[PDB]
Each structure stands twice: as structure tokens, then as C-alpha cells.
Design an enzyme around this catalytic site. Sequence first.
Site, PDB file in Angstrom:
ATOM      1  N   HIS A   1       0.828  -1.338  -0.095  1.00  8.70           N
ATOM      2  CA  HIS A   1      -0.126   0.011   0.126  1.00  8.70           C
ATOM      3  C   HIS A   1       0.887   1.321   0.076  1.00  8.70           C
TER       4      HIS A   1
ATOM      5  N   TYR B   1       1.723   5.377  -2.078  1.00  9.46           N
ATOM      6  CA  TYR B   1       1.617   6.771  -1.553  1.00  9.46           C
ATOM      7  C   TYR B   1       3.259   7.295  -1.717  1.00  9.46           C
TER       8      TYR B   1
ATOM      9  N   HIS C   1      -9.499   2.111 -11.314  1.00  8.48           N
ATOM     10  CA  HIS C   1      -8.810   3.048 -10.376  1.00  8.48           C
ATOM     11  C   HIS C   1      -7.516   3.416 -10.313  1.00  8.48           C
ATOM     12  N   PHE C   2      -6.749   2.650 -10.340  1.00  8.40           N
ATOM     13  CA  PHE C   2      -5.222   2.948 -10.519  1.00  8.40           C
ATOM     14  C   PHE C   2      -4.611   3.565 -11.565  1.00  8.40           C
ATOM     15  N   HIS C   3      -5.209   3.413 -12.767  1.00  3.36           N
ATOM     16  CA  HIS C   3      -4.783   4.253 -14.003  1.00  3.36           C
ATOM     17  C   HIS C   3      -5.155   5.820 -13.682  1.00  3.36           C
TER      18      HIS C   3
ATOM     19  N   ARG D   1      -9.661  -8.606 -13.773  1.00  2.00           N
ATOM     20  CA  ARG D   1      -8.391  -8.056 -13.950  1.00  2.00           C
ATOM     21  C   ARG D   1      -7.357  -9.201 -14.435  1.00  2.00           C
ATOM     22  N   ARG D   2      -6.024  -8.640 -15.013  1.00  2.00           N
ATOM     23  CA  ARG D   2      -5.105  -9.771 -15.498  1.00  2.00           C
ATOM     24  C   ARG D   2      -5.478 -10.817 -16.191  1.00  2.00           C
TER      25      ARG D   2
HETATM   26  C1  HAS Z   1      -0.587   6.534  -6.743  1.00  2.00           C
HETATM   27  C2  HAS Z   1      -1.341   5.342  -6.737  1.00  2.00           C
HETATM   28  C3  HAS Z   1      -2.312   5.151  -5.842  1.00  2.00           C
HETATM   29  C4  HAS Z   1      -3.063   5.895  -5.167  1.00  2.00           C
HETATM   30  C5  HAS Z   1      -2.707   7.343  -4.633  1.00  2.00           C
HETATM   31  C6  HAS Z   1      -4.353   5.222  -4.622  1.00  2.00           C
HETATM   32  C7  HAS Z   1      -5.227   5.851  -3.598  1.00  2.00           C
HETATM   33  C8  HAS Z   1      -6.247   5.141  -2.998  1.00  2.00           C
HETATM   34  N1  HAS Z   1      -6.617   3.882  -3.369  1.00  2.00           N
HETATM   35 FE1  HAS Z   1      -5.460   2.562  -4.434  1.00  2.00          FE
HETATM   36  N2  HAS Z   1      -6.938   0.748  -3.950  1.00  2.00           N
HETATM   37  C9  HAS Z   1      -7.469   0.829  -2.628  1.00  2.00           C
HETATM   38  C10 HAS Z   1      -7.660   2.152  -1.955  1.00  2.00           C
HETATM   39  C11 HAS Z   1      -7.260   3.298  -2.155  1.00  2.00           C
HETATM   40  C12 HAS Z   1      -7.580   4.445  -1.208  1.00  2.00           C
HETATM   41  C13 HAS Z   1      -8.563   4.663  -0.167  1.00  2.00           C
HETATM   42  C14 HAS Z   1      -6.945   5.751  -2.020  1.00  2.00           C
HETATM   43  C15 HAS Z   1      -7.142   7.031  -1.520  1.00  2.00           C
HETATM   44  O1  HAS Z   1      -5.811   7.305  -1.238  1.00  2.00           O
HETATM   45  C16 HAS Z   1      -7.806   7.855  -2.622  1.00  2.00           C
HETATM   46  C17 HAS Z   1      -8.066   9.368  -2.006  1.00  2.00           C
HETATM   47  C18 HAS Z   1      -8.236  10.470  -2.746  1.00  2.00           C
HETATM   48  C19 HAS Z   1      -9.047  11.766  -2.740  1.00  2.00           C
HETATM   49  C20 HAS Z   1     -10.157  12.008  -1.840  1.00  2.00           C
HETATM   50  C21 HAS Z   1      -9.481  12.409  -4.187  1.00  2.00           C
HETATM   51  C22 HAS Z   1      -8.892  13.734  -3.770  1.00  2.00           C
HETATM   52  C23 HAS Z   1      -8.794  14.361  -5.485  1.00  2.00           C
HETATM   53  C24 HAS Z   1      -7.730  15.363  -5.599  1.00  2.00           C
HETATM   54  C25 HAS Z   1      -6.431  15.836  -5.011  1.00  2.00           C
HETATM   55  C26 HAS Z   1      -8.414  16.297  -6.743  1.00  2.00           C
HETATM   56  C27 HAS Z   1      -8.387  17.645  -6.751  1.00  2.00           C
HETATM   57  C28 HAS Z   1      -8.724  18.416  -7.917  1.00  2.00           C
HETATM   58  C29 HAS Z   1      -8.241  19.791  -8.298  1.00  2.00           C
HETATM   59  C30 HAS Z   1      -7.369  20.372  -7.458  1.00  2.00           C
HETATM   60  C31 HAS Z   1      -8.471  20.235  -9.422  1.00  2.00           C
HETATM   61  C32 HAS Z   1      -8.914  21.711  -9.668  1.00  2.00           C
HETATM   62  C33 HAS Z   1      -8.497  22.435 -11.026  1.00  2.00           C
HETATM   63  C34 HAS Z   1      -9.284  22.719 -11.849  1.00  2.00           C
HETATM   64  C35 HAS Z   1      -8.745  23.562 -13.113  1.00  2.00           C
HETATM   65  C36 HAS Z   1     -10.831  22.519 -11.667  1.00  2.00           C
HETATM   66  C37 HAS Z   1      -7.556  -0.394  -2.282  1.00  2.00           C
HETATM   67  C38 HAS Z   1      -8.578  -0.896  -1.223  1.00  2.00           C
HETATM   68  O2  HAS Z   1      -8.765  -0.251  -0.191  1.00  2.00           O
HETATM   69  C39 HAS Z   1      -7.151  -1.263  -3.381  1.00  2.00           C
HETATM   70  C40 HAS Z   1      -7.589  -2.481  -3.395  1.00  2.00           C
HETATM   71  C41 HAS Z   1      -9.007  -2.932  -3.961  1.00  2.00           C
HETATM   72  C42 HAS Z   1      -8.813  -4.404  -4.411  1.00  2.00           C
HETATM   73  O3  HAS Z   1      -9.948  -5.103  -4.331  1.00  2.00           O
HETATM   74  O4  HAS Z   1      -7.752  -4.814  -4.740  1.00  2.00           O
HETATM   75  C43 HAS Z   1      -6.623  -0.430  -4.055  1.00  2.00           C
HETATM   76  C44 HAS Z   1      -5.327  -0.940  -5.188  1.00  2.00           C
HETATM   77  C45 HAS Z   1      -4.735  -0.057  -6.114  1.00  2.00           C
HETATM   78  C46 HAS Z   1      -3.927  -0.578  -7.188  1.00  2.00           C
HETATM   79  C47 HAS Z   1      -3.895  -2.160  -7.407  1.00  2.00           C
HETATM   80  C48 HAS Z   1      -2.872  -2.924  -6.462  1.00  2.00           C
HETATM   81  C49 HAS Z   1      -2.978  -4.327  -6.901  1.00  2.00           C
HETATM   82  O5  HAS Z   1      -2.171  -4.588  -8.118  1.00  2.00           O
HETATM   83  O6  HAS Z   1      -3.661  -5.144  -6.475  1.00  2.00           O
HETATM   84  C50 HAS Z   1      -2.819   0.261  -7.215  1.00  2.00           C
HETATM   85  C51 HAS Z   1      -1.322   0.123  -7.952  1.00  2.00           C
HETATM   86  C52 HAS Z   1      -3.515   1.608  -6.267  1.00  2.00           C
HETATM   87  C53 HAS Z   1      -2.684   2.818  -6.929  1.00  2.00           C
HETATM   88  C54 HAS Z   1      -3.260   3.741  -5.798  1.00  2.00           C
HETATM   89  N3  HAS Z   1      -4.359   3.961  -4.888  1.00  2.00           N
HETATM   90  N4  HAS Z   1      -4.514   1.365  -5.797  1.00  2.00           N
HETATM   91  C1  HEM Z   2       0.034   4.068 -22.505  1.00  2.00           C
HETATM   92  C2  HEM Z   2      -0.960   3.849 -21.437  1.00  2.00           C
HETATM   93  C3  HEM Z   2      -0.967   2.535 -20.792  1.00  2.00           C
HETATM   94  C4  HEM Z   2      -2.252   1.826 -21.108  1.00  2.00           C
HETATM   95  C5  HEM Z   2      -3.018   1.873 -22.368  1.00  2.00           C
HETATM   96  C6  HEM Z   2      -2.519   1.140 -19.894  1.00  2.00           C
HETATM   97  C7  HEM Z   2      -3.377   0.087 -20.059  1.00  2.00           C
HETATM   98  C8  HEM Z   2      -3.354  -1.034 -18.999  1.00  2.00           C
HETATM   99  C9  HEM Z   2      -4.481  -2.080 -18.846  1.00  2.00           C
HETATM  100  C10 HEM Z   2      -5.436  -2.375 -19.998  1.00  2.00           C
HETATM  101  C11 HEM Z   2      -4.162  -2.920 -17.770  1.00  2.00           C
HETATM  102  C12 HEM Z   2      -4.972  -3.979 -17.236  1.00  2.00           C
HETATM  103  C13 HEM Z   2      -4.694  -5.345 -17.747  1.00  2.00           C
HETATM  104  C14 HEM Z   2      -5.081  -6.330 -17.195  1.00  2.00           C
HETATM  105  O1  HEM Z   2      -5.611  -6.341 -15.707  1.00  2.00           O
HETATM  106  O2  HEM Z   2      -4.986  -7.641 -17.573  1.00  2.00           O
HETATM  107  C15 HEM Z   2      -2.827  -2.380 -17.309  1.00  2.00           C
HETATM  108  C16 HEM Z   2      -2.394  -2.876 -16.000  1.00  2.00           C
HETATM  109  C17 HEM Z   2      -1.465  -2.110 -15.542  1.00  2.00           C
HETATM  110  N1  HEM Z   2      -0.887  -0.913 -15.517  1.00  2.00           N
HETATM  111 FE1  HEM Z   2      -1.261   0.273 -17.361  1.00  2.00          FE
HETATM  112  N2  HEM Z   2      -1.627   1.299 -19.116  1.00  2.00           N
HETATM  113  C18 HEM Z   2      -0.948   2.316 -19.362  1.00  2.00           C
HETATM  114  C19 HEM Z   2       0.298   3.090 -18.590  1.00  2.00           C
HETATM  115  C20 HEM Z   2       0.573   2.688 -17.468  1.00  2.00           C
HETATM  116  C21 HEM Z   2       1.174   3.529 -16.239  1.00  2.00           C
HETATM  117  C22 HEM Z   2       1.728   4.842 -16.595  1.00  2.00           C
HETATM  118  C23 HEM Z   2       1.117   2.855 -15.254  1.00  2.00           C
HETATM  119  C24 HEM Z   2       2.327   2.907 -14.148  1.00  2.00           C
HETATM  120  C25 HEM Z   2       2.428   4.214 -13.843  1.00  2.00           C
HETATM  121  C26 HEM Z   2       0.613   1.494 -15.478  1.00  2.00           C
HETATM  122  C27 HEM Z   2       0.449   0.550 -14.304  1.00  2.00           C
HETATM  123  C28 HEM Z   2      -0.210  -0.586 -14.422  1.00  2.00           C
HETATM  124  C29 HEM Z   2      -0.270  -1.683 -13.518  1.00  2.00           C
HETATM  125  C30 HEM Z   2       0.528  -1.809 -12.319  1.00  2.00           C
HETATM  126  C31 HEM Z   2      -1.011  -2.572 -13.991  1.00  2.00           C
HETATM  127  C32 HEM Z   2      -1.693  -3.957 -13.361  1.00  2.00           C
HETATM  128  C33 HEM Z   2      -0.596  -5.161 -13.894  1.00  2.00           C
HETATM  129  C34 HEM Z   2      -1.066  -6.291 -12.949  1.00  2.00           C
HETATM  130  O3  HEM Z   2      -2.387  -6.500 -12.634  1.00  2.00           O
HETATM  131  O4  HEM Z   2      -0.173  -7.034 -12.728  1.00  2.00           O
HETATM  132  N3  HEM Z   2       0.081   1.780 -16.644  1.00  2.00           N
HETATM  133  N4  HEM Z   2      -2.630  -1.138 -17.991  1.00  2.00           N
HETATM  134  O1  LIG Z   3      -2.967   1.099  -2.844  1.00  2.00           O
HETATM  135  O2  LIG Z   3      -4.019   1.628  -2.964  1.00  2.00           O
HETATM  136 CU   LIG Z   4      -3.493   0.130  -0.896  1.00  3.10          CU
END
Ligand code: HAS
Ligand code: HEM
Ligand SMILES: [O-][O-]
Ligand SMILES: [Cu+2]
Lengths: 31, 166, 554
Positions: C225, C229, C376-378, C441-442
Site C-alpha cells: 500500500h 503513496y 481506479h489505479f490508472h 483483471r489480469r
Molecule cells: C498513486 C497510486 C495510488 C493511490 C494514490 C491510490 C489511492 C487510493 N487507493 Fe488504491 N486502492 C485501494 C484504496 C485506495 C484509497 C482509499 C485511496 C485514497 O488514497 C484516495 C483518496 C483521494 C481523494 C479523496 C481524491 C482527492 C482528489 C484530488 C486531490 C483532486 C483535486 C482536484 C483539483 C485540485 C483540480 C482543480 C483544478 C481545476 C482547473 C478545476 C484499495 C482498497 O482499499 C485497493 C484494493 C482494491 C482491491 O480489491 O484490490 C487499491 C488498489 C490499488 C492498485 C492495485 C494494487 C494491485 O495491483 O492489486 C494500485 C496500484 C493502487 C494505486 C493507488 N491507490 N490502488
Molecule cells: C500508454 C498507457 C498505458 C495503457 C493503455 C495502460 C493499460 C493498461 C490495462 C489495459 C491494464 C490492465 C490489464 C489487465 O488487468 O489484464 C494495465 C495494467 C497495469 N498498468 Fe497500465 N497502461 C498504461 C500506462 C501505465 C502507467 C503509466 C502505469 C504505471 C505508472 C501503469 C500501471 C499498470 C499496472 C501496475 C498494471 C497492473 C498489472 C497487473 O495487474 O499485474 N499503466 N494497463
Molecule cells: O494501494 O491503494
Molecule cells: Cu492500498
Amino acid sequence: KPKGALAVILVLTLTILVFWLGVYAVFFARG
Amino acid sequence: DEHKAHKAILAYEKGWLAFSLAMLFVFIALIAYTLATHTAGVIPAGKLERVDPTTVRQEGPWADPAQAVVQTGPNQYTVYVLAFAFGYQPNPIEVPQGAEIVFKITSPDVIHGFHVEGTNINVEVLPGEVSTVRYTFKRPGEYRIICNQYCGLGHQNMFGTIVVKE
Amino acid sequence: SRVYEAYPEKKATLYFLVLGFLALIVGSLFGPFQALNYGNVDAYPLLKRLLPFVQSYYQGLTLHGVLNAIVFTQLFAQAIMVYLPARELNMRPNMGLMWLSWWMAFIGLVVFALPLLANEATVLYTFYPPLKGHWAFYLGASVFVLSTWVSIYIVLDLWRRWKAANPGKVTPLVTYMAVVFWLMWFLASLGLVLEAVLFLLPWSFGLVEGVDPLVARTLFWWTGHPITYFWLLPAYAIIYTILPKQAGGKLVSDPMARLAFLLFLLLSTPVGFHHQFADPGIDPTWKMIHSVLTLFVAVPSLMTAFTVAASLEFAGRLRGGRGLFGWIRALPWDNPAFVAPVLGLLGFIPGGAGGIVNASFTLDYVVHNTAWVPGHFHLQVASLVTLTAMGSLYWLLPNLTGKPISDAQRRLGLAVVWLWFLGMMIMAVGLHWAGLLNVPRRAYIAQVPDAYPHAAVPMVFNVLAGIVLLVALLLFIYGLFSVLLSRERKPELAEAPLPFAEVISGPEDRRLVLAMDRIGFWFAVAAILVVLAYGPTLVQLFGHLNPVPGWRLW
Ligand code: HAS
Ligand code: HEM
Ligand SMILES: [O-][O-]
Ligand SMILES: [Cu+2]
Ligand SMILES: CCCCCCCC/C=C\CCCCCCCC(=O)OC[C@H](O)CO
Ligand code: CUA
């Protein structure tokens, strides 16, 4: 009043809320 | 100008931090609720229950799929399912609607997914441990089981079936 | 270059950035193909001709996740979170250590690439036992990650050295961010070090027969996790301390920004069970605990959403935009360094939202292990972090190399940034929706074309995303190599200060700030939270190990 910041965090709250109640409803349908 | 703007952004930030927290806590209450109702049966019993993945297909409850569905209560079935590369036994799992199903799932090789499309049963299967989850099918018919954990090059085709009889 | 003698840390930071970027390009090649796959289109026979070492969709997927989510992100974190504090302090990092760190990263990468490219480690970037990858994957990966410990050391060194020269001063903002960030990372990482050390390495060399899946996942997710972050916070440091200058405005609050960062230090690690909602053998009560803690960790981003929004509003007002929308029009949408971060912030809204759904324990049973998660994670890492990196290249690259960005290059940059963004939003709709229709997925789904009829509509989005993102990657390759392989140089670009934003003064409470500067104390607290959240469960698992034989099924 940081009125623009307020709109953004409104849109965020609705996004959160829709995603959440949306998924919770699905959880109960499948329950 | 600035000193004014900074006070006002700060005053509202606090509002929002208090509103956000409330939102989150509401979600905590709403989740707690789900925990107290039958729908929570899909959460695994987090009890360890070790088994030997190398003998699990030759002795004990997973070694005879046609006897894997056992009545264990007046309205309860227990089902010893095997998730393996790349299928499940029994195929199909046959159970009555409206009865409680305790699924006891293990794997003889690698980790698999056990996700029953249409239902909230969605549990990881780890070799050496039994996964225990509960569900009551409220509607007859055929539900498909999908493997949602990469298990090798047969992953995409690992499917099973549950038949819930009227 | 005499600039590189005065600032050898520019050259090192440069080498991190470049390696990280190469890694992203190679990793991304697999992306479009995977999108077409989640669109039910099989273009693998085409990839396998263009790149004949690719034996399977799954080997592609390993490369993609490892290259993009592990390597690029880390290199980027190490480039940003050493060099930025260095420049703020105007002090040299221990350069001997800094080259060491880069070589460990490099050698670890090369070594892990070997079995990866050879089809000996098709286990994905989560590498869950019993799936048994080649010993060079585990050893390369371990040395690659350990490289961050040397970075941790470099920044604390810089930190203490400044505190030595300046007792009774507060740590400057960026440096405070980087310290709390590096210390969080130290805690966070021990879960994977423990799994590589007690389990993965010995097993991959045949010193043990099996590994317990439960205990390995649990140790993995301890780090799993907070690694995410760890990817995000460098983008945050930029968004906080650089973005506002780029927007035409200022940071509205230093203390609030330290607060966010402090909370990440406290809440990034003790939450790993939110990845184990569907695992056997972990008490439901613990899953509730972690679920609560994870909703807490949402707070500092909820906080960040308002601070950054307000900073942008301020910038748009300063720049003469009246109204409830007029500040948005007034922002510098011609500057790629402004636009990329802001767009990533856009999609971070739904991404955060999906995240909160994932956290909610029982709601995870709806979406766990479906296309939803990748959706979610993209939004999080593939969009907001990567976009932040890309955009920042427009100031970072001249700051470090001396080479100028032409107007044409600026425009190419805009296009890439926008296409990348749009592609990501389109693909996020495909995957979320698909996930709601129980598509896993995957999976190489295109290879079972009749399995998910119900998903026809969201599939079309996945195809569309596929093409858009192919186009943006091709634009990104072509653009990145123009700047990098350009004849011209201009060293006063490499000397013009980093565009750090100015804060707005209104008294903050200095006491809050001083309280936040009690860094050793907060580190203690953070350490205890991990012991309380993991200890009881790891004690119960380590007392009931069930190691199981390993498989290779690819
Ligand atoms: C950078 C990477 C990642 C972040 C950050 C991220 C944040 C969260 N995630 Fe996550 N997610 C999970 C929980 C959340 C939680 C509660 C948050 C929170 O931190 C999110 C909080 C954020 C907010 C409340 C949004 C605030 C928004 C902002 C800051 C926008 C501001 C807009 C502005 C300022 C625009 C203004 C400008 C104008 C011009 C209008 C959990 C479960 O509880 C799973 C597992 C689910 C499962 O079944 O596996 C999970 C799994 C994933 C996976 C897959 C792991 C795998 O391969 O199995 C990845 C890589 C990942 C990435 C990331 N995750 N997450
Ligand atoms: C050119 C854009 C790219 C496309 C079109 C894209 C598309 C995808 C899609 C379709 C999958 C899901 C495949 C599956 O679950 O079978 C995947 C998985 C993944 N991608 Fe990307 N991807 C992009 C760029 C990246 C970026 C920049 C990140 C990281 C910074 C990244 C991180 C991941 C990860 C961690 C997985 C999960 C692989 C796994 O489940 O083991 N993606 N992407
Ligand atoms: O890692 O959400
Ligand atoms: Cu997590
Ligand atoms: C100027 C450039 C803008 C152009 C961008 C378009 C904007 C959005 C609309 C459509 C794109 C769809 C492309 C998808 C291509 C084929 C889909 C497919 O594979 O069809 C499956 C069918 O449903 C089962 O038979
Ligand atoms: Cu079994 Cu995927």
C-alpha cells in the site's frame, strides 16, 4: 469566500457519493 | 488582499475538513451495518485451517467431488470446492435455493480466484489454507464461477458453474 | 560542463530521470495492446512479431506493471525527493552515496530484466507465491528497491546538516516533505524486505521447499500500500511547491501542506488489509480496523484537494478571472508544466472516489480483482503521477541540462499531455464499467471472445483508449527524443532557479508547525501504529506457517 475551490470540492463530494451509494446498492442487489 | 484571502480559504478549508470527516464516518457506520446482516457471510471466517495441497486430491473431503456437497444443518449445505489450474470441482456445484451454503475452498497448486458472477462471493483461494464463505442463493439457475487471480496461461479460461435448483 | 562541477547532483538527478523515462516508454509499449485486449481485440500476434521475446500476454503484463508502476515511479521519486530538498537548502547531497544509489537501481534493473525478458519470471509485479520466479528477478528487484535506503540516508544527512547550522529553525517546507516521505518509506518497505529476506530469496535459491502464501501476501501488502503513496508524494511536492508558481499564483498554506504530509507519514503503512479483504485466515475485526484506518488515509488528500484548488483559484484571480468559472479560463493553459499536473488532478477525483469504494471492506467484494481496480489505479498513478512527471519536464529538463524547450516542443507537449489524459479518462470508463460487469483483471480476454457479451459497450471505450494512448505514447517518444537529442545548449537555463512557489503569510500558528517538526516523535508514533496493526496477525501467522511447493505455469 474561496468560491471556485468550493465548486471543485462539491464536484469531488458528488463523485465520491455517487460511486459509493452506487456500489453499495450493487452490493445489496448481489447480497 | 492576501491576508484577507488567506483567512477565508482557511476558514472554509476547516468547514470542508469537518464535512469530509463526517462523510467518512457515515461510510464507517454504513459498512458496520453490512457487517451485522446475512450479506456479511461473504466475508471469510478468518480462521486458519491448514491442509496439505499435495494430498488434498487423494485423501479427505476434496478427493471426491460427487460427495462434496454435504448437508450439515436442517437448512445448511457445506461444499468442498477445489480451485486448481484450470477449473473447479465439482463441475457443476449443485445446491438448493434458499439454503445456506458454506463454501470451503482450497487449491492444490497456485492461488486462484473464486468469484460467483451475480453474487457477492469473491474470495481468494490460497494453497494450504481453506477459505470459508457463506451465501444463500435466492434465485434458481446457473451462476458462473470466474478465476480473478492470475494463475498462469490458462487464467482466461478458468471457469466453473454453480447450479441452484428450484 | 562547469555547471555539473558546481552541481554534480544535476547530473545524477538527470540519470535517474532518464533511466526512469526509458523504463516508462518500454513499459508503456505493452499498454495499448492490453487496452485492445480489454476491448476484446487481439493484437498480440502483432506484438509478438515486433517483439519476438514476448511469449505471452502475461509476460507483457509483468513488464508493464514492473517497468511502469515499480521502476519509473521509484526513479522519479528518487530524482524529485533528493534533488528538490537539496536545491531548497542550497546544499550538496552526499555525491558518493548518490552515485551508489543510482548504480544499485541500474544493476538491480538490468539483473531483474534478464529472467524477465527470458520468460523466467512471468509472475506479475505482485509475484505471489506459489508462483515461483527466477532467483535473478528476486535479487535484481531487492537490490533495486534497497537503493531507496541510500536515498533515505542522503536526505536525512542533508536534513541533519542544516539543522546543525540552524538549531531552533523549522525545517523548510520541501525538506520537511522529503524527510517525512523518506521516513514513511523506510517503515513501509520493511514488509517487502522481510518477505524477500525470510522467504523469496531462500526459496528462489532452493534453500527452502515452500513458502506460505498467506504470510507472503501479508508481508507484501505491508509494503504494497505505502509504495503507492510513495509514488504519489513526489507529484504532491511539485503540486504543492511548484504548481502554484506555474499557475501564476502562490501556495495558500505551508502548515496545511506539512499537515497533509505528516498524516501520510502516520497513515500510509497500517492499512494493508484493504488488499486482503478477500483472503482467508485474517480475522474480520482486523479487516474492519484496517478499513477505518484506510478511510483516515483518505483525509490528507481530501485536504490536498482543497488546498491545491484554493491555490489555483487564487492564481486565476490574481490573473484577472472574475466569477465562479472565470478563474479557470484565466489560468495558463498554454504551459504544459501547468496543464499536466492539473489534468491529473482532474481524474484523481474519480480515482479517489473508486479508492474510497475499495476501502469499504464489504464493498470490495463487488469490485475486487475485476477491471474496476485497474480503472481506479490508472487514474491515480498512470494519469496523475505520470502526467505530473511529464509536465514537469518543461522546467526540470532545462534546469538540469541547459537545453532549451522550443515553442514547437511546448506544443507537442500540450498535445501529448492532453491525449494521454483523455485516453486515461476513456479507459477508466471502460475498466470501471467492465469491472461492474464482473470482468476480471489480469486476463487475456480477447482470447476467450464470447465470455463477456454484456460488456460490448465498455469494450469500445477500451479500444478507443488503446488507439488514443498509442498516439500519445508515439508523440511522447518522438518529443522526448527531440529535446534530449538536440544539438543546442544554453547553460543559464541550467542556472536559473527552480520555479519554487511563494507562500502566503497570515500568521499560521507557529505552534502547529513546531509540533509538526517533532519528526523523531512522529516517526516513533508511525512505527508503533504498524506494530499495533500488523503485530498480532503476524505473530499468529508466523506461529502456524504452512509453506507449500512452488509452481511455474507459464
Ligand atoms: C498513486 C497510486 C495510488 C493511490 C494514490 C491510490 C489511492 C487510493 N487507493 Fe488504491 N486502492 C485501494 C484504496 C485506495 C484509497 C482509499 C485511496 C485514497 O488514497 C484516495 C483518496 C483521494 C481523494 C479523496 C481524491 C482527492 C482528489 C484530488 C486531490 C483532486 C483535486 C482536484 C483539483 C485540485 C483540480 C482543480 C483544478 C481545476 C482547473 C478545476 C484499495 C482498497 O482499499 C485497493 C484494493 C482494491 C482491491 O480489491 O484490490 C487499491 C488498489 C490499488 C492498485 C492495485 C494494487 C494491485 O495491483 O492489486 C494500485 C496500484 C493502487 C494505486 C493507488 N491507490 N490502488
Ligand atoms: C500508454 C498507457 C498505458 C495503457 C493503455 C495502460 C493499460 C493498461 C490495462 C489495459 C491494464 C490492465 C490489464 C489487465 O488487468 O489484464 C494495465 C495494467 C497495469 N498498468 Fe497500465 N497502461 C498504461 C500506462 C501505465 C502507467 C503509466 C502505469 C504505471 C505508472 C501503469 C500501471 C499498470 C499496472 C501496475 C498494471 C497492473 C498489472 C497487473 O495487474 O499485474 N499503466 N494497463
Ligand atoms: O494501494 O491503494
Ligand atoms: Cu492500498
Ligand atoms: C477526430 C478523431 C475523433 C475520433 C474518435 C472517436 C470518438 C468516440 C467514438 C467512437 C470511437 C470507437 C472506436 C472503436 C473501434 C471498434 C470497436 C469494436 O471493436 O467493435 C465491437 C462491436 O461492438 C462488437 O461487434
Ligand atoms: Cu485460476 Cu486465474
